[PDB]
Paper text:
[FeFe]-hydrogenases are nature's fastest catalysts for the evolution or oxidation of hydrogen. The complex Fe2[μ-(SCH2)2X](CN)2(CO)42– with X = NH was shown to integrate into the apo-form of [FeFe]-hydrogenases to yield a fully active enzyme. We herein report the structure of the [FeFe]-hydrogenase CpI from Clostridium pasteurianum in the unmaturated apo-form and the first high resolution structure of a fully active semisynthetic [FeFe]-hydrogenase along with the structures of three non-natural inactive derivatives of this [FeFe]-hydrogenase with changes in the inorganic active site. In contrast to already known structures of native CpI,3,30,39 the space group of the crystals was P21 for all five enzymes and the asymmetric units each contained two nearly identical molecules.
Author numbering: 1 to 582
The structure:
């Protein structure tokens, strides 16, 4: 047994762990910065986690194991001086102007500067930020005047995607982070998943803003602005309004969106039910046609980019159904005018997404018809929160309201899209009913749920056994393919999400402090809201959505045929690179 003494207090433990972990486990305060995802910045350690081990000297707590008889002071004058000195050095390369900053309310660096009363040896005040800023991407932005070179983004990219699209670069003899060859991220193997943003302690990495698109549309007299939120937003955005984790704020969002002046309140969960209508039908068609198997989901634009960039031979195997976002958008410019009298060109469709890659998806040149974009703007969960706060809307105090039903109703199947395994489960509910011409009672596919990276199941459909898999995170797609798992059996239907946990852990989601991530399983807690909705909804199958059924009966016809097939689908092709202008 190890006996260790920390700030005078004796501890008896068998644990083999770091000083930082043990201290955090035992409510002892130790600061940290570059340590995240069980890695610190091995080159250029930040040393913010410095503690004193009597007899040894100053050590970095985040990668120093506890040892029997250690006497540790986390708070000696020597320790605080070192840490304060490290923060001072960072201030020397940091434009410290928190007033207008988009991380002002939850910046890890600001909190450290305050805690240690750090001051720059010389304030960093660049007169021209243009050379520090990269806004070329459809999804990501970089502001290097904020960058601490902590490496958290580089490490998070590697672990979450294994693309290493985010790199340390030598630019004119000075270190920066950025994409390969300092290119626009979009032009590299990057998935635009934004996991790098989520890992950033400061405002250096952000989403490409669509807030001006939205505000200009809202203010244009002739525009009719639709807004529709993704499943995950209602399980997440309350975090930014002091409501804590795992709170369902669906009704509040609807009210807030009306107060922001949006002209129609719909819901992307309605779009998810549409995706299932088409994709479940397509699965049943492929069963009839002996393929092409496997069918892959196509609702995650991070995964679509991964396939385009690494596995172009799989593109024809993707489901042709548009994603919940784009399929909704398509309907919003066609069906919705048909039931409203609106001039289609005056409809402006806005989504709220937990995702940065959705911005790239919405701006794909061919995601339009007759000159009308499926989706005109995509704002992240974070962007919506800022919009609500700017408008002085008292979010946490709002009464609940309802969505406009025509493209706002949703089933429990659509509701769970935000969790890894969600589209798989939702699809199977409809596909098995369709194939067996039945209304089955047993609809919960718990085998495809949860945080395991690769999840498989055998599903009986119309008295044959089919093999399905759920790939949970872009790194696990690479594992699945590179390890040859893909060739161990015939797979028939495979879900792929780029973000581990699914969209509840997307790149547009609220940041979470590393200390809170230690206490809260954010992927599980956000997803729980969605599964809870599913359990409590009367309709738990996409094809039982009454507003959806009306829409097909009155406008689209039958899924996978006719008008539905013509405009609610999208196929990806391998082709020579071009600027999107072409
Ligand atoms: S990144 Fe943090 S410390 Fe820097 S200006 Fe923004 S809020 Fe202030
Ligand atoms: S968006 Fe995703 S793939 Fe691209 S650099 Fe960031 S973490 Fe890596
Ligand atoms: S962009 Fe953010 S996470 Fe990446 S090195 Fe800079 S401060 Fe760290
Ligand atoms: S898993 Fe969801 S949030 Fe992540 S890239 Fe895919 S669609 Fe976006
Ligand atoms: S947090 Fe330990 S070296 Fe950075
Ligand atoms: Cl309506
Ligand atoms: Cl979602
Ligand atoms: Mg290390
Ligand atoms: Mg208006």
């Amino acid at each position: 047994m190890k006996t260790i003494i920390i700030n005078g207090v004796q501890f008896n433990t068998d644990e083999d762990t770091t000083i930082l972990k043990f201290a955090r486990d035992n409510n002892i305060d130790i600061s940290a910065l570059c340590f995240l995802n069980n890695c610190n910045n091995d080159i250029n350690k930040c040393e913010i986690c410095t503690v004193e081990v009597e007899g040894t000297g100053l050590v970095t707590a985040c990668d120093t194991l506890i040892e029997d008889g250690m006497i540790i002071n986390t708070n000696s004058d020597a320790v605080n001086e070192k840490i304060k000195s490290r923060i001072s050095q960072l201030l020397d390369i940091h434009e410290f102007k928190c007033g207008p900053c988009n991380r002002r309310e939850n910046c890890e660096f600001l909190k450290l500067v305050i805690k240690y009363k750090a001051r720059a040896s010389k304030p960093f005040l660049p007169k021209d930020k243009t050379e520090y800023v990269d806004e070329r991407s459809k999804s990501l932005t970089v502001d290097r005047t904020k960058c601490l070179l902590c490496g958290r983004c580089v490490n998070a990219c590697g672990k979450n995607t294994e693309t290493y699209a985010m790199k340390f670069l030598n630019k004119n003899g000075k270190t920066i982070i950025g994409a390969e060859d300092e290119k626009c991220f979009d032009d590299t193997n990057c998935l635009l998943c934004g996991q790098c943003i989520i890992a950033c302690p400061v405002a250096a990495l952000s989403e490409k803003s669509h807030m001006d698109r939205v505000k200009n549309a809202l203010n244009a007299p002739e525009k009719h602005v639709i807004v529709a939120m993704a499943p995950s937003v209602r399980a997440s955005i309350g975090e930014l309004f002091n409501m804590g984790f795992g709170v369902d704020v669906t009704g509040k969002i609807y009210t807030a969106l009306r107060q922001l002046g949006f002209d129609k309140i719909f819901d992307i969960n309605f779009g998810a039910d549409m995706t299932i209508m088409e994709e479940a039908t397509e699965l049943v068609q492929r069963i009839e046609n002996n393929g092409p198997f496997p069918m892959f989901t196509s609702c995650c634009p991070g995964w679509v980019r991964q396939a385009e960039n690494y596995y172009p031979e799989l593109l024809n195997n993707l489901s042709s159904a548009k994603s919940p976002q784009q399929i909704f958008g398509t309907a919003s410019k066609t069906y919705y005018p048909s039931i409203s009298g609106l001039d289609p060109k005056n409809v402006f469709t806005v989504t709220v997404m937990p995702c940065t890659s959705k911005k790239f998806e919405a701006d794909r040149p061919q995601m339009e018809k007759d000159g009308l974009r499926d989706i005109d703007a995509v704002i992240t969960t974070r962007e919506l929160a800022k919009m609500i706060k700017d408008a002085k809307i008292p979010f946490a105090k709002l009464e609940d309201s309802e969505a406009d039903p025509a493209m706002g109703e949703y089933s429990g199947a659509g509701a769970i899209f935000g969790a890894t395994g969600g589209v798989m489960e939702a699809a199977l509910r409809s596909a098995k009913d369709f194939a067996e011409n039945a209304e089955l009672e047993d609809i919960e596919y718990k085998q495809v749920r949860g945080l395991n990276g690769i999840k498989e199941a055998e599903v009986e459909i119309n008295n044959n056994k089919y093999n399905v898999a759920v790939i949970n995170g872009a790194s696990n797609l690479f594992k699945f393919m590179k390890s040859g798992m893909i060739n161990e059996k015939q797979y028939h239907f495979i879900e792929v999400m780029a973000c581990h946990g699914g969209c509840v852990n997307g790149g547009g989601q609220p940041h979470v402090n590393p200390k809170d991530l230690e206490k809260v399983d954010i992927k599980k807690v956000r997803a729980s809201v969605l599964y809870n909705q599913d359990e409590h909804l009367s309709k738990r199958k996409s094809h039982e959505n009454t507003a959806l059924v009306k829409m097909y009966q009155n406008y689209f016809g039958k899924p996978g045929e006719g008008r539905a097939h013509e405009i609610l689908h999208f196929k990806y092709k391998k082709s020579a690179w071009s600027h999107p202008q072409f």
